[PDB]
Structures are given as structure tokens and as C-alpha cells.
């Protein structure tokens, strides 16, 4: 906000009614009123002042701090003691640079009255949640904040996967509408890479959601148990779609390979025809007589009765190999 | 019926004895008599008035309404509270357009005394159930309606799979009856696509049926537990048939690829023969004498004793490479 | 027997001591004495009078009758109520027509004092059991009849699988005894089809036997529990042999494909040699002098000092490409 | 021993202290003293007198006798009643004939005070155990005899697998030390066959050992429970090594196939070069002038200004296709 | 230390506060004070005096001694009695020789107050732990020593796997940045070998860590239960990365094979073009007239009206096969 900010991207105190207020860098001195309003803090994991405040503030165990300030992580849920669970989520990387896969990683520390979220590269889901909040229809408690974040991450991953599916649909309909048209490589490769890199991170998030759906009594009240369950369902459906997409890509690749091999065989057949017709014919014409037509007026060759038997032999060979080429 | 209908395809109050009656758009004022007769409503999921009535009528939780008015779904059973389970089923798409796979989706909300079914594209199973009903031999309670719908969906999926099997049988018997005959591509591809798209939706329905068969005490009385079990069995058998069909298609594809590769090798062999016979022979005839037979009457060549040794060398080379080509 | 029979193939009342007696079509009026003797009925599932009697006689639930008069089934065991289990078994189809796989289906309804068996195509196991019975050493109770049927079905499936194994052994020993000999296709294909079609039905029968072996206290007394267990073992062993046979067939196929590809490469090498030796040599001889030896007695060419440098260039090219072909 | 023996290979009464004594064919009249010494009998499963004595002696249930006198078996453990378990083990076939895989089968009937072992083809492990015994350091009870047999069978299977691994190591180091050197086929094939045939029988023995390790309280006192456990471990390690060996063989095969395909492409490239250089050049020289150098002293051709434009066209074609061949 | 050492690499008595002291070969006479300080001994498994002392000292069961002085082992945890567990770990082999895979094996015997570690080839993790210790910030109890060893082994295995990933990234970005550039073989092969040899040993260590994380109450106090759990997590992540790396390598290999096959087809097409254009044209020029231009001034050929029809036939053939080659 006004003045320079150390590491705090979005400092927003909730309201308990979907509303809220931004607090900015002067948040160590907030006195939250009766416990309906949570407090949300979005931190830049790269800025060293963020890690500084994160080490000594809001009383996090040094184990926890070291657990969400790592470099490489995989999606997982982690409960540490009567409160304070840790969730490691993966965005979908709609950054101006590239690569929808290679998913941005979002790390959440969920308390009963605080949520602290970490990221390196900006996420869309967080801006969605923010504009949701100041619109007066956002979440109202910590569990609701985590649910909104997960919901938006999934609402974008499924959009991406449906886009991949329509891309494959266009490729296929083009390939089969035309004929002897190869599918555009360097696109099937990118789609395969994308499906693999998506599954690699979506497989553990489904389990995160399943775990968040089963009991999680005190933290994330079962009011949202079925919501977490249907998020689990949506990721299951998306993984099914990913496997179907991979199998469709493999079918396209096998079809293309078979096509080029059959075309190879066809051109080899034509090559054999061209040779076997002309190589002998160019040899038998070797001992042929005068190569100009009708030397003595009526009939060009004279004395042919001796050696003319050769034109029959190469003709027999030709028709033999021709029947030998057909079958 | 008479007058214009908002979204209600089939409004049919059951009878408890297989009979029933159609009610039409004036159904908010039905007073069902003593509880033997259910009430069935088939809605068009696309018409906005259907979703309008569905939001505020028959007292469905907003969660439920939002759960069966989605766009993309996968087959699953869902129990929500002492009553009112939700089933998401997949037809087989016998629509005039195309594609037996890409299965029509049927979504059922089953109560103890009401069934509400949703669809976008028309389904055969529903017309089957209707003509069954007004024939006086249809279902008589809600569980029976859901069972009839599932039974008809399966009675058509197995017909489709047996059709696929006979198609593969015809293809194979043709291929092996003839010889060097390639199987009709663009048909093996469609059959493979069909098997994959069928399995993608049949794998969860088997689990739906298994779940509906295990306890489901209060809702779907165990009178039909064994019926749901045998529906589970039939889908298991059909999935086995689908895997067998996929493996048969893969065998046909490998056979065709091997055939074209071996034919490629054969035509390359013939090409090598044609060249290795004539390329040397066309070279040794280069320094040959007069290309017309018997110049000095008796014997055509003169002075051959010097350079005639060459015709032996290329002949040795020819028989060498010929023995080198055979083995 | 004497007189015309409606649908009853083998009507044989057991004895409790392995013996028995045939009853024929007049069996509705048998009064079985003190309960040591069962009653066996082998029915033709196709004859409509068999299904007629089967609907209303021996008091079978209409669900049961409809369950074993289906068209397509998979092997499974099915218990229905304090008695009366249903077993669906698969023979091995030693019929004069064809196809050891595509196994004949045998459907058994086992009671405490009755066995009713159904089939379309004749089975060997049943004739085995019959000739066993009238020999005085057959079964003596219902469980024993079902066990004998299963035992004979397995005694024939393992014979078939061992035959397949010896066939593969002969094929392999021929292929490796000789060299550059392709395995007989259209036989590897049939063996692969046979293994697949056998496994498709043997996988559920193993589970049938396991289930029949675990408790089945009242029906099939544990006197035969270990016998059912060893039948389970034998089918497990046969499935292991089937997987081993499939892997051996795949090894043979890969060996053949590698062989034809390497032969293809070899003939391409020979083709390149034939061309690269003669194509240049046939070109350099183009500007060669008189193609007859020793024109001016001593040395054929005159004035060669100008253009004779060319015979070195094509020779350098030849030895270059020859060294380029070797490595 | 002295006199002729019916079927008893090794008749050795143990001692309880690792020692013992051979008894020979006169063993029906041994009166074992206070129960520290077991009694071991190694029988030839082929000799009919062995099966004769085995049917009626040492009081084995006819079920048991029929269970270990079968023809085809798979490795399994089998407990039958308060005593008397049955183990079916597989040797490694170090017989002078051939085939380390195709493992000799050893069948053990273990009592609390008797061990009876059956075999067709001689086993090394048994001679090991014998020379161990008369050395004064052999087993002392029945469980110890079975453990020694299993221990020796494993000590030889792992030797064989390590030999396979070093063979693959030598093959690989040769292949990569040299270049364009194909791996010795007919050896990779034997190693693959060997790994498959070893796994086929080692997979169930691991389970035999695991079962023998879990409780087996009364029979095989838990004094050896951890020993059976580490035997389980050793077979697990050997199966891991077998899978690694199979994957290494597959890598070698793919490398060889890629190598021959790339060499095929290379020789095709050289063939295309040889033709495309000389086929046009041999055609343009067709209408060339006098093929001898310098006819009118200074410059050989006369009147070339009309048709000399052709030598440019085929040169353009040549450089075109040459650039078309490179890229 | 000073004087010659028999087999003891690192003899270091801990301190209970991260500190400690080296003891050297005179350690049989240490009297550890009140039980906060453990005692660590790193032994060379090859030196026979190490195995000598290890057989009779620190009171290890002969079973244990024989269990960790084996030759071939796989990673596993092993508890033997109220104390004294055995862990078999695998380093990453950063030895000057070669092969990051083929991992050095570290074998630990963990007591409540003693740790005894064995190795053949030197390990980095142990030097790390040592320099950690004498820096005053090392472990302080036995469980902490085992945890530090495992932590360092993992901190190096993940470094190696990330290096493999960046190597593949460089290879891919090169391949796709350029075009028709083959990936560097003999590097993809080494990376595949490395991934396989890493997984072969990392799969059991993950289970070691999971087991060490679940209860292990008395030995390895649950103070480190979550630490062992996150070590389990890190190995799970690394195995995921290994599978992703293998799939990326397979994609690169398939892309290269497709590229060489398509280039093969392209050069075959060019070869067919070169022949089919010139082979006929070189034949029709056979009977062509004078090969010098304009013999009678105005028009070179005379009498062509008879046989000139041939130049049309070979031209028709040429354009036919050309259209036959395109499609």
C-alpha cells in the first residue's frame, strides 16, 4: 500500500461475512475483535524480509518455517498439533512467460484464526480470491480461504485440460478430414509434455483433497467436508481426462508412424517397378540393331532370326518379377 | 402435453402396480395418495425454466442443485442425508447424429417418493421405461425406476459391445480367409476409440452398481440388492470383453505392420536381384564386340582370347552376390 | 432313453455309494429314499421344453431361472439363501468343430440333494462323470458331483495348456536348430489367441474355486475344502504357464522381426555394393577408348596421357565409399 | 549301501548334535531313542518301489501321497493338521545335461520327527547337506533339515544370478568399448530365457519363506523364524536383480535395433549419393561429343554453343538434390 | 590417529551437546560418564581386524555380525530385541573413480548408547557428519547419528537427481532449438542406466524411512518421527522425479527414432525421383538420333515421323509415376 512494503503482497483481515479490509505492513499491532474475522497474509517467498518476519512472528515452530521455505516440494497436507496444518498446493502458471505445466507452487499455513500463504511466481487464484473478497462475497474464515484457493486452482486446471482436449480434437479432425496429412509434430510433443507435467502434480493434490474431506473435524469443519470431496472428484475426473488424452496422443503417433512406413513401402514398390521395367529393357536394347526406324524401307532388322530369341527372355523375366512384385 | 411445456419432458406419476399416469406441467398441485405411488419427472437440463423450477421446488439443497446442473461430470453415486441420493449415469448415445461412445449423461436424484432425472441429449432408456410404464408393466417405486434406467442403459451398452465384437470377427475372418489383405484401417481406429471411450465411463458405473448393491438399506431395499449385484456383474463382463477387444485390435495392427515390413523386405530383395543381375551384365557388354550376331558367318568375335577373361569375373561376382543374397 | 426325450440329456439318480441309476423323462414321480442319494439332471439349454420344465419344477426362484438361462455369462459362484448355490463353469470345447478356446459354458445349480446342470454344446467332462458313475466309482452327493465336474474341466484345461507348451517347444527347437528360418506364422497367432481366450475364462474360475475352498460350511462340507483348494492351485499354475507361454511367443515374434530387419539391412548393403562398384565403373568406361583389346598390337590406347587422370578419381571415390560402407 | 537299494537314495538318521548315521534299506526296524534325533529319507520319485513304500509306510494320508507324487507342481507350502507340513521347492539344475533354469523340483514332507524328501533329477543341495552331516556340523532336527535344504538352494540360485549379471557386464563393456559392434545374440536370448524361467519359480518360493517366517510356532520353532525371514530377504534381492537384468537386456536390444536402423539409413544415404551423382552425369555424357580428348588439337568440342546449355541443368539438379539430401 | 590403526576409521565419542572427542584405537577402556554421550565407531568392512574386533566386542549376536558382514545386501531396517536395530543404507558414490549410481553401501548397528557403522568404499556423508561434530553442532545421541547419516545421504541423492534433470533439460533445449539434430546418445544411455540404478536402491530406503517414522518408540524417540517422515517424503519426491526423467528419456528416444525413419523415407523418395526421371530418359535417348545438335543446319532429326511416338510414352510414364510418388 502507501509506503514501501517489505514482503507482504496482500495483507487482508477478513470480516466473518465475506467482507474485510486491507491492513498493509502495519499489521503486528492489529487487535482482532471477537473471533469471527481471520487474518490473511500473502508473502513473497523470495524476499528475504518475508522469511525474516516468518521466522520470528506469529509463533511458528522452526520446523514449520523450515518446512515451507524449502526450494523443491511436492503437494502434500501436513498436520502439526491441535491446530496449524500445512498445505502445499500447485497453481497452473498463467504467467506471461510460458509453460502452463511447471505449475506455480502455493504453500499455505492454516490456523484456526490465521492463514499465511507463500509463493515465488504470482498466481491467478490469489487475485481471484482478493477481488472476490473486496467485492463482499469472499470467504469468511480460515478454512474458507484455503477452500477458495483450492477451488480456484482446480477451476483453472480443468480449463487447461479441456483446452488440451479441444486442441487434440482439432488436430484429429484435421488429420482425418484430410488424408495422408501428418499431424503437426512439436505440438503433440508439447501436449504430451503438458499432460505428464500436469499429472505429476495433480496426483498428490487429489490425495490432499481426499484427506481434507475425510475427518478434519476441528480445523476444517465438516460444513466443507463434502466440498472438499467434490474437489477430490473433480481432480479424479481431470486425471481420467489426462490419461484419455495421453492415449489419444499415442494413437495419433502410431497412426503417423504406420502412415510413413506404408508410404515408404509404396515408394519402394514404385522404385522397383521403374527399375525392373527399364533396367532389362535398357540391356536388351544393347545388342539391338540400328536405333533408327526402317533402315531398308520395309523392315528395319535383317538377320534377326539368329539372336532375336533374347527379347523373349527378358520379357519373361519382366512379367515374372512383375507378378512376383504384385504377390 | 396439451399447451406449451416449459422444460418437463415426461411428467409421470407412478401407481405402485406398474401402471401410472402422465401429469404434465400442472404438477405442483398433485396430492399423492397413500404412499405407494412415486412421482417421476424427466427434465431437459438445457432449458432454463427447468433449472429455474429445479432451484426452488421439491426442496433440494442448493448444493445438490449445483451438483447435478454442472457441465462436465463423471459417473458416481452420492448420498446426502437420510434420503435423497444422487446418481450420475451414462447412456450410449443412439442419437441420429453419431458416436455410440461419447455417452449421453443421465443424472438422477432419487428420493423415497420422488425421482428427478436430467438430460441434455435424448436417451433411449427413458423412452423404453416410459412405454414400459404405460404398458402396465413398468416400475412401481423410486428404487425400481432407478433400477429400470440402469438396466436399460446396460442392456444397450452390452448390445453395442457385442456388435463391436462381431465387427472384429468379420474383419479377422476376412483378413485370414484372404491373404496379403490389409485390415480396413479407419475402422480399427474407430473401434479402438470406441472401446476406450466406453471403458472411460463404464469403469465408474460398475462401482456405482457395486455400491448400490452392498447395503443401501433404507433407500433401495435389498429386494433389489442382488439385481444391482448382477448389473455389476454384467458391467464386469462387458469390461472384460472390452479389454479382449482392445487386445485383438492390437494383434491385428501388429500383424499388419509385420506384413508391410516383410513385403518391403521382399520388394527390396527383388530390386537387388534386378540390379545385381543387369548392372554388371550391362557393364561387361560395354566392351563387348559387334552387337549384331555372326559378323564373319561362323563366329562373331575375333581376337577375344586377350580380353575375354572379363566375362568370367563379373559372372563370379554375380553368383557370389546371388549366394550372398540368399543367405 | 426309450421313447422320445424333451430336453433331459442325462437323468441319473445317484446312490450314495458312487453307483446310481438312470431315470429318464419320468422323474417327477421319483420318491428318493433316506437322504444319501442325490439326483442329477443334465439339461439342454437350447431346447425350449428344458426351459419350460426349468421355470416351473424343482421350485427355483424366478430370479435364479432367469440367471442361468441367460445368453452371455462369465464364470462366477453365487449363493442364494441357506441352500441352492449357482456355479457358472467353462469347459474346453473338444467338439468336432473347432477352437479349444471359446470354451463351452456349463451352468450348475447345486442344492443339498439336487444338482441341475445346463449346457448348449456337449461337454466331455459330463460324459466322463457319467461313465464314472455307471462304473460304480462316481460321486455320491451333490457337492461331489460339482467337484467331479470341476475336476474334469481342469484335467482337460491343463492337458490343453501342456499341449500348447510342447507346440511352442517344437517351434523354438526348430527355429534355433535351423538358422534364418522364420517361425511358422498363423500358428504363433493361433497360440496367442488361444492363450488369451483361455486366460479370459480361467481367471474367474480360480476365484470360484478359492471361494468354494474357504468356508462353504453347510453346502460343500470341508471334507472337500482342501480338494477345492488344490483345484485353485492347479488353475493358478496353469495361469502361470499361460503367462510364460505368452512371453515366449512375444520373444519369438521379436526375434523374427529383428531377423527380417537385419536381413533387410544386409540386402541393402549388397545393393549399395553392387551399385557403387559398377555405376562409377560404367561411367568412367564411357569416355574409354576402343572397347576391343590391343588395337595397335602392343598397347591399345594412344594419347591417354591427357585424360587418363579420370580413372584415378573414380577409383578413389570407390575405395572411399567402400571404406565408408564398412564403417 | 551294501546290497541293492529299492528307491532310497540317502537314508540318514540324525543325531541331535549335527552328527548322525546312515541306515540304508533296513530302516523299518529303527527304534529312535529319546526324541532328539530325527530321521531323514531321500527318495527317488521315479522308482516305483519308492512310491510303493511311500503309499503304505510312515502313515501318510493318501491325499498327501497323491499330492507330492504329482507330475507338474509349483512351489508352495501346505500345512495338513497339527503336524506334517508339505513344502515344494525348486533347485537350480546343475546337472551335466543343461539349463540352469528349468529347475529341479524338491518336495519335502516335514514332520516333528521325520523328513521325507522326493526328487526326480539329482540335486546339489542334498549332497551338500549330506557331506555337511557326516562332517559332524549338519542339522539336528527336522526344521533344521528343511532350513538347510532351502538355504543351499538359495546359495546356489544367487550364485547363478550373479553369474548372469557378470555375463551381462562383460557383454556391455565389450559393446561400449568397441563401436558399431552388435551384442552377441543367441546369448542375450538365453539370458532372457534364464531370467524368466528363474523368476517363474522364485516368485512363489519367496512367499514360502515368508509364510515359514511369520508364525509356524509348533513345527518350525521361532529360533529359525528370523533365518527364514532373511532367506525371504535374499530371494527378494535376487528377484530385484532379475528385474534389473531383464531391463538391462532390453536396453541392449533397443540399442542394437537403433544401431542397425541408423546404419540402414546411412547406407541408403550413400546409395542415393552414388546414384544422384552418376545417373545424371552418365545421362548428360550421352549426347557428349567425341569421348577422346582434344580431337582438333586445341579444343575438343566444336559447335557446342547450341546444346552446351544442358551441362548446366543437370549440374543444378545435382547440387539441388545434394542440398536436398543433406537437409 | 597417532600410531597405526587396525580398522577403525573414525573413533568419536559424542558429547550430548553436539560436541565430542576422538578416541582412536584405545577405546576398549573408555568409561562413558552419565548416559548423555553415545559412542560412534566407523569401521572399514574390508580390513580383517575390523571383522575380528566386530565378532568379539560390544557383545553383538553372531547372527548380527554375520548379517552386516555379508557381501551383497539390499537396503532394509532390522530390529533385533528390545534394542540394537540394524539399518542398511546406500550412499551415492562420489568417489574419484566413477559411477554415481552403483551406490556405496553403509551398514549401521544402532544401540541406545552405541553406533557402529561399516563401509567398504569411503562415503561423503560420514565426513560431513564428522566435520559437523568437531564443529560443535553435530548430533548428540545415537538416533541423531543415524538421522544425520540418512539426511546427508538424501541431501546428496537429490543433488544428483536434480543434476540429471538439468542435463536432460540442456539436451532437450538443444535438440528443439536446433532442428534435425540427434540427441547425444551414449549420454541418454548413461542417464537411463543412472535412473534405473538409483531407483533400484532408493525404493527400499523410502520404506526404511517410513518404518523408522511410524512408531519406533523406545529407540528413536518420536522427537525425530516427523523428521524421518519428511525424509520419507523427500525420497518419494525423488522417485517421482526419477520416473519423470525416465519418461522424458523415452520421449527423446522415440522422437529420434521417428526422425531417422522419416529421413530414411525422405532419402528413399529422392532416390526414386532421381531414378524415375533418368532411367527412362536414359533409355529413350538410346534410339535417339545423332547426339550432336543440328546436323542438317535447320532441324537435326530426319524421318522421325515413324518412331518419334516413343518420346510420348516414357513421358506419360514419368508424369504418371511422379503423380504416383506424390500421392
Tab-separated table of C-alpha atoms in Angstrom, chain B residues 109-307:
chain	number	residue	atom	x	y	z
B	109	UNK	CA	-31.990	-37.503	-7.887
B	110	UNK	CA	-33.635	-40.393	-6.056
B	111	UNK	CA	-35.859	-39.780	-3.045
B	112	UNK	CA	-38.057	-42.198	-1.134
B	113	UNK	CA	-41.089	-40.933	-3.062
B	114	UNK	CA	-39.692	-38.830	-5.933
B	115	UNK	CA	-37.313	-39.319	-8.833
B	116	UNK	CA	-35.995	-36.376	-10.837
B	117	UNK	CA	-33.921	-37.117	-13.915
B	118	UNK	CA	-31.902	-34.694	-16.034
B	119	UNK	CA	-30.513	-34.961	-19.551
B	120	UNK	CA	-29.240	-32.804	-22.398
B	121	UNK	CA	-29.447	-35.205	-25.385
B	122	UNK	CA	-32.372	-37.641	-25.583
B	123	UNK	CA	-31.895	-41.154	-24.235
B	124	UNK	CA	-33.406	-44.404	-25.454
B	125	UNK	CA	-33.583	-45.969	-21.986
B	126	UNK	CA	-36.064	-43.320	-20.887
B	127	UNK	CA	-38.437	-43.954	-23.781
B	128	UNK	CA	-38.089	-47.664	-23.017
B	129	UNK	CA	-39.060	-47.037	-19.402
B	130	UNK	CA	-41.986	-44.852	-20.433
B	131	UNK	CA	-43.508	-47.268	-22.951
B	132	UNK	CA	-42.896	-49.898	-20.281
B	133	UNK	CA	-44.889	-47.849	-17.772
B	134	UNK	CA	-47.964	-47.044	-19.825
B	135	UNK	CA	-47.980	-50.691	-20.915
B	136	UNK	CA	-48.864	-51.524	-17.307
B	137	UNK	CA	-45.659	-53.441	-16.533
B	138	UNK	CA	-43.248	-50.674	-15.558
B	139	UNK	CA	-41.721	-49.905	-12.173
B	140	UNK	CA	-43.747	-49.075	-9.100
B	141	UNK	CA	-41.385	-47.249	-6.701
B	142	UNK	CA	-38.424	-44.893	-6.887
B	143	UNK	CA	-35.769	-47.570	-6.438
B	144	UNK	CA	-37.474	-49.530	-9.202
B	145	UNK	CA	-37.301	-46.511	-11.519
B	146	UNK	CA	-33.580	-46.078	-10.947
B	147	UNK	CA	-33.063	-49.808	-11.417
B	148	UNK	CA	-35.009	-49.808	-14.680
B	149	UNK	CA	-32.975	-46.895	-16.011
B	150	UNK	CA	-29.696	-48.601	-15.133
B	151	UNK	CA	-30.922	-51.921	-16.522
B	152	UNK	CA	-31.801	-50.410	-19.884
B	153	UNK	CA	-28.545	-48.469	-20.097
B	154	UNK	CA	-26.683	-51.737	-19.589
B	155	UNK	CA	-28.919	-53.699	-21.971
B	156	UNK	CA	-27.822	-51.249	-24.636
B	157	UNK	CA	-24.140	-50.990	-23.743
B	158	UNK	CA	-23.768	-54.755	-23.998
B	159	UNK	CA	-25.553	-54.789	-27.352
B	160	UNK	CA	-23.059	-52.205	-28.574
B	161	UNK	CA	-20.078	-54.173	-27.278
B	162	UNK	CA	-21.303	-57.409	-28.853
B	163	UNK	CA	-21.695	-55.508	-32.109
B	164	UNK	CA	-18.083	-54.375	-31.828
B	165	UNK	CA	-17.040	-57.977	-31.218
B	166	UNK	CA	-18.856	-59.264	-34.300
B	167	UNK	CA	-17.335	-56.445	-36.352
B	168	UNK	CA	-13.855	-57.504	-35.277
B	169	UNK	CA	-14.809	-61.111	-36.017
B	170	UNK	CA	-15.802	-60.224	-39.574
B	171	UNK	CA	-12.615	-58.204	-40.068
B	172	UNK	CA	-10.424	-61.039	-38.809
B	173	UNK	CA	-12.160	-63.781	-40.758
B	174	UNK	CA	-11.820	-61.688	-43.919
B	175	UNK	CA	-8.137	-60.972	-43.271
B	176	UNK	CA	-7.232	-64.607	-42.638
B	177	UNK	CA	-9.552	-66.031	-45.307
B	178	UNK	CA	-7.789	-63.913	-47.889
B	179	UNK	CA	-4.030	-63.423	-47.809
B	180	UNK	CA	-1.806	-60.323	-48.037
B	181	UNK	CA	-5.003	-58.341	-47.399
B	182	UNK	CA	-4.625	-55.428	-45.028
B	183	UNK	CA	-7.361	-54.927	-42.430
B	184	UNK	CA	-9.526	-51.919	-43.153
B	185	UNK	CA	-7.913	-49.057	-41.295
B	186	UNK	CA	-10.137	-46.141	-40.288
B	187	UNK	CA	-12.276	-48.945	-38.877
B	188	UNK	CA	-9.807	-50.456	-36.436
B	189	UNK	CA	-9.174	-46.865	-35.371
B	190	UNK	CA	-12.864	-46.221	-34.751
B	191	UNK	CA	-13.244	-49.494	-32.866
B	192	UNK	CA	-10.253	-48.662	-30.672
B	193	UNK	CA	-11.593	-45.169	-29.989
B	194	UNK	CA	-14.967	-46.709	-29.192
B	195	UNK	CA	-13.560	-49.248	-26.743
B	196	UNK	CA	-11.528	-46.570	-24.974
B	197	UNK	CA	-14.395	-44.095	-24.743
B	198	UNK	CA	-16.676	-46.843	-23.487
B	199	UNK	CA	-14.307	-48.037	-20.772
B	200	UNK	CA	-13.678	-44.467	-19.610
B	201	UNK	CA	-17.305	-44.254	-18.467
B	202	UNK	CA	-18.057	-47.906	-17.731
B	203	UNK	CA	-15.310	-48.236	-15.133
B	204	UNK	CA	-17.097	-45.929	-12.633
B	205	UNK	CA	-20.597	-47.264	-13.295
B	206	UNK	CA	-19.509	-50.727	-12.219
B	207	UNK	CA	-18.562	-49.156	-8.895
B	208	UNK	CA	-21.877	-47.295	-8.751
B	209	UNK	CA	-23.679	-50.613	-9.080
B	210	UNK	CA	-21.438	-52.353	-6.556
B	211	UNK	CA	-22.116	-49.600	-4.020
B	212	UNK	CA	-25.841	-49.743	-4.737
B	213	UNK	CA	-25.650	-53.485	-4.134
B	214	UNK	CA	-23.831	-53.669	-0.814
B	215	UNK	CA	-26.053	-52.199	1.879
B	216	UNK	CA	-28.279	-49.230	0.838
B	217	UNK	CA	-30.779	-50.493	3.394
B	218	UNK	CA	-33.393	-47.781	3.759
B	219	UNK	CA	-33.401	-46.276	0.279
B	220	UNK	CA	-33.114	-49.144	-2.177
B	221	UNK	CA	-34.465	-52.134	-0.299
B	222	UNK	CA	-32.348	-55.265	-0.552
B	223	UNK	CA	-35.151	-56.765	-2.623
B	224	UNK	CA	-33.079	-55.304	-5.465
B	225	UNK	CA	-29.657	-55.781	-3.854
B	226	UNK	CA	-28.980	-58.917	-5.884
B	227	UNK	CA	-30.334	-57.200	-9.000
B	228	UNK	CA	-27.847	-54.378	-8.580
B	229	UNK	CA	-25.227	-57.061	-7.974
B	230	UNK	CA	-25.949	-58.789	-11.271
B	231	UNK	CA	-25.864	-55.419	-13.029
B	232	UNK	CA	-22.401	-55.050	-11.515
B	233	UNK	CA	-21.592	-58.491	-12.903
B	234	UNK	CA	-22.790	-57.583	-16.379
B	235	UNK	CA	-20.655	-54.462	-16.475
B	236	UNK	CA	-17.682	-56.501	-15.247
B	237	UNK	CA	-18.218	-58.950	-18.093
B	238	UNK	CA	-18.514	-56.108	-20.588
B	239	UNK	CA	-15.268	-54.557	-19.363
B	240	UNK	CA	-13.570	-57.932	-19.778
B	241	UNK	CA	-14.912	-58.048	-23.330
B	242	UNK	CA	-13.614	-54.527	-23.947
B	243	UNK	CA	-10.105	-55.469	-22.852
B	244	UNK	CA	-10.237	-58.582	-25.022
B	245	UNK	CA	-11.374	-56.455	-27.970
B	246	UNK	CA	-8.542	-53.986	-27.461
B	247	UNK	CA	-6.003	-56.802	-27.361
B	248	UNK	CA	-7.457	-58.326	-30.536
B	249	UNK	CA	-7.187	-54.960	-32.280
B	250	UNK	CA	-3.567	-54.640	-31.185
B	251	UNK	CA	-2.872	-58.119	-32.554
B	252	UNK	CA	-4.409	-57.142	-35.893
B	253	UNK	CA	-2.309	-53.970	-36.010
B	254	UNK	CA	0.934	-55.796	-35.249
B	255	UNK	CA	0.109	-58.405	-37.878
B	256	UNK	CA	-0.478	-55.691	-40.475
B	257	UNK	CA	2.734	-53.863	-39.589
B	258	UNK	CA	4.742	-57.082	-39.801
B	259	UNK	CA	3.110	-57.837	-43.143
B	260	UNK	CA	4.010	-54.491	-44.690
B	261	UNK	CA	7.559	-54.704	-43.333
B	262	UNK	CA	8.053	-58.189	-44.755
B	263	UNK	CA	6.628	-57.078	-48.103
B	264	UNK	CA	9.043	-54.146	-48.002
B	265	UNK	CA	11.916	-56.566	-47.457
B	266	UNK	CA	10.646	-58.754	-50.301
B	267	UNK	CA	10.475	-55.925	-52.820
B	268	UNK	CA	13.922	-54.771	-51.733
B	269	UNK	CA	15.179	-58.299	-52.405
B	270	UNK	CA	13.635	-58.274	-55.879
B	271	UNK	CA	15.153	-54.849	-56.530
B	272	UNK	CA	18.587	-56.099	-55.531
B	273	UNK	CA	18.169	-59.103	-57.817
B	274	UNK	CA	17.139	-56.948	-60.780
B	275	UNK	CA	20.128	-54.655	-60.322
B	276	UNK	CA	22.799	-57.213	-59.454
B	277	UNK	CA	21.858	-59.263	-62.482
B	278	UNK	CA	21.775	-56.416	-65.007
B	279	UNK	CA	24.092	-53.691	-63.695
B	280	UNK	CA	27.180	-55.927	-64.142
B	281	UNK	CA	25.846	-57.558	-67.292
B	282	UNK	CA	25.196	-54.119	-68.778
B	283	UNK	CA	28.781	-53.162	-67.905
B	284	UNK	CA	30.561	-56.219	-69.307
B	285	UNK	CA	28.601	-55.792	-72.537
B	286	UNK	CA	30.206	-52.348	-72.704
B	287	UNK	CA	33.466	-53.578	-74.181
B	288	UNK	CA	31.661	-56.402	-76.000
B	289	UNK	CA	32.325	-56.694	-79.723
B	290	UNK	CA	29.867	-56.091	-82.547
B	291	UNK	CA	26.363	-56.169	-81.099
B	292	UNK	CA	24.977	-57.966	-84.181
B	293	UNK	CA	25.167	-61.737	-84.414
B	294	UNK	CA	27.679	-63.640	-86.504
B	295	UNK	CA	29.647	-60.950	-88.330
B	296	UNK	CA	32.115	-63.311	-90.158
B	297	UNK	CA	29.499	-66.021	-90.659
B	298	UNK	CA	30.784	-68.704	-88.301
B	299	UNK	CA	31.894	-66.967	-85.098
B	300	UNK	CA	31.162	-63.318	-84.320
B	301	UNK	CA	34.185	-62.333	-82.166
B	302	UNK	CA	37.798	-62.243	-83.310
B	303	UNK	CA	40.832	-61.673	-81.117
B	304	UNK	CA	38.760	-62.349	-77.994
B	305	UNK	CA	41.498	-64.512	-76.430
B	306	UNK	CA	43.089	-61.376	-74.948
B	307	UNK	CA	40.245	-59.694	-73.053
